[PDB]
């Protein structure tokens, strides 16, 4: 394969200053005429001029009006257009091409493609080269003048980046629109849209300069009623960047556009943000609760890129975390502020510790700044986004608010209108650090290891209390396991937010403080500590690490009950569960392996169960937080602690633990499920798409969690509750009634009922597909066949494909069937999908990431399927790279 290395970065021998496009859309072809106003850089050594250009049909090539001819002045191999250096001018020149492309047959959804009846582009990372010739890398910044033409009846709305400067009629029922984007940009931020779109709009006045900005949100006509919440979230995003960071929008107009067929969630094209419809569109009667948080996050995120990615862009793709980690962090600040619920932070931690930690101990492990790639699209990873975001957040922890804002300002001001690197950001933070320490010899050189070193650190603790001196010490050790990226790992700069809880009264004993661990180990001593404390460690999840608290379960229960920090309470609970899961897992495993006729299981700690009940009944604990305490740790979290994991032994373990707790708490669960009803399902705001009560939504989450526990338990007469729940006007409730009905005969009637409620809204039908896919049914394989034949059919919509298959891959007992049939099913879908959409095919490989953590029969079965996929003729470079890396071949 063809490998790009970070260390090999060099500036181009060329400059592209201006790009002038005409995109002429017809039914069976799109003609793209492009003039590049180019020049020779100071790095030029008389080399050939080589453009990226993939799958393009050439009509004509010229330089300065001289026609160039294939085989004589240029060569084109379907990937690269080479202009021989003899025909490359030595000063400013104009390069003209005209090519033909075919959005209508573009099912990979990269470059220019048709989604239903909308023509749309996706250019990040390397899709601009599928539209026209370019030096398609983010340091080649240029200004763009873009004209689009199309049939007027079919494509009445024409959009590109920036100010619309002309609109005109064209003979034969066509029309055109011209755009000028005055901000220098890389080609990955180009976008065009043509469709029969409807919109909502509002005017926003900026806080500091009072500039009038026109805000437009667009969709197909059928779903214009689903646009309001996105618009409100855009307003909130703008306000937040103005209020927290002092950053105002920089164009007269910002368009957001929903399309049905999209590979990811959204894209930050300057002034023209394009979204998966599932991440822009919602209505309270036709969307599950989670859509509202999703839209808030995705709108905010793409908005925040306007500075962190757009106004300050990437020198090269290896710097990807500089925009993505930083923008995830910005959005996390925003969402925490908007929702005001601890579940926002917990959900982000839950994701990191399950999905990202699994990736970081897999053969796919990479640092947040990768050293190499074949397809850059494979490095849009939880490591780069989510571990990146935690690395970006640690600066805030280390500096505090005041100095963090100063360092961010240095960064944004210095590099505005330009490219940047991770080093530039660290340099800006280092300036704030020197100010904060009042010391110009302080530096953040060590901090750079968070960019270059892979793997999750392990942080462990020992404690000592001297009652005569009233003095308490916390001894801390850090360790990162060697891996294929570094055979020798170094200590990181690890900020450890801490408090100290008096176990006797449950109260705080110190002002919150942050320990700065910079060595392999260190001892932190506290004086005037009146009694032996229970330490509250990594408050707020203050670094992206495995925490080994060395606490007893009795200490953990006390933190769960009385600590102030939501993360530490949740983590304490998590650790109690993990101790139990490992112990019972080992017990079941020994019984299976030794073929024992009888054996013991360690019961769940009864004091822990009492502590669960106490929290559940506390009316001033967050309902969202409660739903995390009654749920066991995610399977992908648990697997990081087990080698050679037998998935059926784990499933048996989880079932035991849940049954143990339910046997004690099911009446409490039922009583809470009924007592929460009035507030949970209150219809305040049901017609208001500009206000969302996130607390109320967490109450519904908790009811629906409780109902699932009670259903699995076959609690007496719970079927009546499930039937009544199916009558709720909230989709979150009536779809939960379908999942929870899995344990009863009524499942297929609920399946039909909810199908009928879902089938006329494309996005709600996809939520119904997911609900079916993740149903706890012994007959799930037959149900998947039914969905394939009756609903999915031949769809190439990535949302449909993901909905049918991915939730199912989280069915521990069924997807991991020892026959290997679950691995064969998903492998066939991956290979199928790879023939038209390589990015989606790689997304579908997710469940294989943990292959080398499984018992050796399952490792063999997964491996067999991965190697079979790898043997497929014409496998994409995306899929081939992914699979070779995942299987220790690359
Ligand atoms: C983290 C999220 C709020 C949304 C996320 N989108 C992004 O980060 C966009 O800003 C990201 N620039 C889109 C993208 C482009 C190419 C390959 C992958 C992804 C996304 O699309 N997730 O599915
Ligand atoms: Mg083509
Ligand atoms: Mg469809
Ligand atoms: Zn992004």
XYZ file of C-alpha atoms in Angstrom, residues 58 75 84 92 97 100 214 217 299 335 369 404 433 542 564 567 570 598 602 618 696 705 713 725 799 811 832 847 854:
29
model
C -11.107 15.143 -19.238
C -0.348 12.163 -18.424
C 5.662 17.851 -17.459
C 2.172 33.372 -12.245
C -9.550 22.176 -17.043
C -17.150 15.474 -16.582
C -28.857 35.826 8.099
C -31.732 26.056 7.716
C -24.784 22.066 15.187
C -23.294 21.351 25.812
C -1.310 12.935 16.140
C -6.897 29.079 29.446
C 1.424 28.667 31.586
C -9.496 15.091 34.948
C -19.950 16.027 45.627
C -17.826 11.515 38.034
C -20.232 7.179 39.171
C -21.614 -27.445 41.271
C -19.846 -14.450 45.164
C -33.205 10.633 46.925
C -37.305 15.864 31.981
C -34.119 1.973 32.081
C -37.219 -9.707 35.418
C -46.317 2.743 27.597
C -28.356 5.378 7.783
C -25.842 -8.235 21.296
C -21.191 -5.929 -0.041
C -17.216 -5.001 16.109
C -11.704 -12.685 22.901
